[PDB]
Amino acid sequence: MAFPAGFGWAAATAAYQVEGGWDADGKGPCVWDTFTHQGGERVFKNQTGDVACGSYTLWEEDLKCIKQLGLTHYRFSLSWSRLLPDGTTGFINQKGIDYYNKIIDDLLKNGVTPIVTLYHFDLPQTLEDQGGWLSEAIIESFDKYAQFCFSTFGDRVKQWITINEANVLSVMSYDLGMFPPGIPHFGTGGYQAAHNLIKAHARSWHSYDSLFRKKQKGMVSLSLFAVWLEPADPNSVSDQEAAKRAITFHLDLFAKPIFIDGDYPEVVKSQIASMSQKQGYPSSRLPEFTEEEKKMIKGTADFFAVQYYTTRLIKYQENKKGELGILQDAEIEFFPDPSWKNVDWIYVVPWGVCKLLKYIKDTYNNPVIYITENGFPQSDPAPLDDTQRWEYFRQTFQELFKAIQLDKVNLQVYCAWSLLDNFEWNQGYSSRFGLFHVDFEDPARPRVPYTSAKEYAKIIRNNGLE
Numbered sequence: 001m002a003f004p005a006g007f008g009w010a011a012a013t014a015a016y017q018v019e020g021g022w023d024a025d026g027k028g029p030c031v032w033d034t035f036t037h038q039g040g041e042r043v044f045k046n047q048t049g050d051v052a053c054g055s056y057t058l059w060e061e062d063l064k065c066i067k068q069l070g071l072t073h074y075r076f077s078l079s080w081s082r083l084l085p086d087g088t089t090g091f092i093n094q095k096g097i098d099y100y101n102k103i104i105d106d107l108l109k110n111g112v113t114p115i116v117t118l119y120h121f122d123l124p125q126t127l128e129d130q131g132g133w134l135s136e137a138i139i140e141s142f143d144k145y146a147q148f149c150f151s152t153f154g155d156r157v158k159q160w161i162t163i164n165e166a167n168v169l170s171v172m173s174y175d176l177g178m179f180p181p182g183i184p185h186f187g188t189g190g191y192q193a194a195h196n197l198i199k200a201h202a203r204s205w206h207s208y209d210s211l212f213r214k215k216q217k218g219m220v221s222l223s224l225f226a227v228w229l230e231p232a233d234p235n236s237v238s239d240q241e242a243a244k245r246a247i248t249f250h251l252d253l254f255a256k257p258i259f260i261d262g263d264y265p266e267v268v269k270s271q272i273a274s275m276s277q278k279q280g281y282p283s284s285r286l287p288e289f290t291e292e293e294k295k296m297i298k299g300t301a302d303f304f305a306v307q308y309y310t311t312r313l314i315k316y317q318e319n320k321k322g323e324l325g326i327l328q329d330a331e332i333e334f335f336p337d338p339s340w341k342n343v344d345w346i347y348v349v350p351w352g353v354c355k356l357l358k359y360i361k362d363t364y365n366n367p368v369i370y371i372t373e374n375g376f377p378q379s380d381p382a383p384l385d386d387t388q389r390w391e392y393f394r395q396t397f398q399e400l401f402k403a404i405q406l407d408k409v410n411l412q413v414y415c416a417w418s419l420l421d422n423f424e425w426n427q428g429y430s431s432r433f434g435l436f437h438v439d440f441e442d443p444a445r446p447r448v449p450y451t452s453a454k455e456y457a458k459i460i461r462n463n464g465l466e
């Protein structure tokens with residue numbers, strides 16, 4: 001199983017998940033500083049990313065790991081609140097700039113291509129206080145942050161992810177309120193956040209395109225979380241239609257405007273508009289794009305960035321009682337197959353990635369695809385000789401090879417989540433996604449390879465499978 005010559009083999013991190021130094025060198029607080037510091041059992045064991053992997057202090061150790069793997073690409077994020085303590089360029093933290101420039105220069109020294117995420121679930125607290133993604137102000141704030149990053153780092157960085165998993169963010173932060181700012185707004189806040197996230201991304205694309213592309217010659221997208229979805233009863237038409245609609249709701253809601261025509265999917269507009277009217281709203285809970293907005297949003301991604309972990313079965317569930325929520329809007333329920341293995345929400349369904357890649361190819365005009373996250377967690381106690389987890393990886397790489405060979409999908413980069421065991425949001429350190437083990441009790445935060453690391457290094461070196 002030889003992969004294409006020049007295939008990208010990568011690993012990913014995120015600033016809040018690995019950096020620590022949450023208040024080092026004049027860094028401003030982000031929403032995760034505030035949220036984890038509040039405690040109240042919203043995070044496993046009231047854990048924080050105050051130190052995490054200590055990557056702000058221990059970049060040289062991360063680089064060792066990257067070199068050991070022989071990665072061709074390394075994905076990481078820029079901390080907005082580290083670079084710009086108040087969110088704006090009124091005050092620039094030079095030690096922040098120096099830090100990321102050291103990552104970039106080191107990677108390039110070593111032939112490793114950076115894939116850089118501007119914003120990864122971690123708003124500066126100041127900007128959240130001014131409304132976050134629920135308010136229009138955020139669009140210009142984000143656009144200006146993006147231009148600052150393009151300006152500062154774009155002479156060396158050519159592959160950008162503006163926003164990590166805008167779909168997960170919308171839902172977790174603003175609808176369910178499981179992420180900061182932590183207030184539930186079922187059926188309402190998610191759609192408002194999504195609307196501003198889409199606009200902000202499109203604006204940053206146009207800024208790149210107008211101001212930076214000619215000289216810098218890079219490409220810009222945003223990453224979208226994708227769960228592959230199958231009908232619960234494969235013969236049921238309503239289930240078949242419900243699985244399709246569930247894909248449309250969680251993935252195409254974002255990807256259609258940006259890649260296709262600047263507007264939401266029609267089934268999304270019609271389902272939400274209908275429930276909204278029955279609920280006594282004078283306007284749909286899904287904000288509309290203006291005609292000018294549709295034109296600005298359409299075609300604002302240079303490649304398709306997808307993050308795949310798992311699959312679910314979908315059953316149609318009529319919203320008889322007119323209940324308020326995204327699931328109720330889509331009129332679906334989801335659940336695993338009893339046969340599937342899992343750690344946390346990650347049910348091991350490798351063929352899901354093949355189905356997804358074919359879907360993306362069919363739906364989004366055969367685009368260039370980067371898988372900017374894929375991986376598997378272990379629970380404590382996590383064995384260093386993680387032979388069962390490596391087997392999940394092996395099967396996943398077989399599905400990628402099939403998608404390339406059989407389905408002719410233009411998959412160019414695969415990025416493993418994660419380089420390091422890290423702070424897995426609400427799960428804290430209890431979910432270990434790393435190729436490298438990290439001891440969080442040890443003040444030196446030593447990195448030690450899992451078996452997966454050794455095995456991944458072989459895949460990369462051979463550019464393919466046994």
Ligand SMILES: CCCCCCCC/C=C\CCCCCCCC(=O)O
Pocket residue numbers: 171176227246247249250310312326327330334345
């Ligand atoms: C990780 C598995 C996620 C599967 C979701 C796929 C279905 C897509 C439809 C939109 C659902 C959005 C809400 C998801 C979280 C709701 C869980 C809950 O009831 O608290």
Ligand SMILES: CCCCCCCCCCCCCCCC(=O)O
Pocket residue numbers: 167168170171172175190191194225249250251253326345
């Ligand atoms: C508001 C936009 C509507 C689109 C719905 C997007 C749904 C995204 C997928 C469900 C959330 C999964 C959360 C990530 C994993 C986890 O933390 O459990």
Ligand SMILES: OC[C@H]1O[C@@H](O)[C@H](O)[C@@H](O)[C@H]1O
Pocket residue numbers: 014017164165168225307309373417424425
């Ligand atoms: O949504 C699934 C994943 O999303 C990533 O963006 C995040 O960095 C991971 O820790 C995990 O939450």
